[PDB]
Amino acid sequence: LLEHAVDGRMLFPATGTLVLAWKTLAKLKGVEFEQLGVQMTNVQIHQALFLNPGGKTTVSVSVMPITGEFQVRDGESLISSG
Amino acid sequence: LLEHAVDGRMLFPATGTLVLAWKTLAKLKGVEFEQLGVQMTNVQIHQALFLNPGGKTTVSVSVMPITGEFQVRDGESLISSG
Numbered sequence A, B: 001l002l003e004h005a006v007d008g009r010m011l012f013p014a015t016g017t018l019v020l021a022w023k024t025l026a027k028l029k030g031v032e033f034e035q036l037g038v039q040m041t042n043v044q045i046h047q048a049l050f051l052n053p054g055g056k057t058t059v060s061v062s063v064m065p066i067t068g069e070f071q072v073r074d075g076e077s078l079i080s081s082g
């Protein structure tokens, strides 16, 4: 993930919030993420996680059980929604 | 809560889900629910909840941290939203 930069700065991909919501619904459904067929709609990105070499960055996903609304919150600030 | 029936049907009050959502937000915030000023919007009572007299009913209120989307549910059935 360090090999994805934009003008030197190292950003978290915009498709990383899809594989994070897709790996959190699979857990919610008790299935392996590679055996679940998902369809995310109206995915929005409000900020950009700033990676850093030799460091650890944490992010909290939260998928609403029935309806299917998901967050990728990083504390109190939203990094993505859909 | 059993002293509220509609032609013999003992239903859970529509404002019952308002308090459950109100108390859940306070528990998420850590504050006491009586010290919290809330505002629910578009509270749909998706389906009716028939309270079981002389028994116990379970709900699974869920509030999204930042957006505020709350949801009262029982198993895989939706009972409220907003």
Ligand SMILES: *P(=O)(O)OCC(C)(C)[C@@H](O)C(=O)NCCC(=O)NCCSC(C)=O
Pocket (backbone or CB within 6 Å): A006, A011, A012, A013, A014, A015, A045, A046, A047, A048, A049
């Ligand atoms: P201002 O114009 O208010 O800034 C809005 C920003 C922060 C740009 C926000 O709306 C945004 O789009 N952030 C970046 C989204 C992102 O994660 N992009 C990186 C992955 S895609 C790639 C080719 O960069």
Ligand SMILES: *P(=O)(O)OCC(C)(C)[C@@H](O)C(=O)NCCC(=O)NCCSC(C)=O
Pocket (backbone or CB within 6 Å): B004, B005, B006, B011, B012, B013, B014, B045, B046, B047, B048, B049
């Ligand atoms: P169908 O046409 O799908 O029926 C929809 C029903 C079952 C009517 C559903 O919308 C429903 O039960 N809504 C009522 C929720 C409710 O009971 N609210 C008030 C609490 S009881 C009271 C006023 O005594």
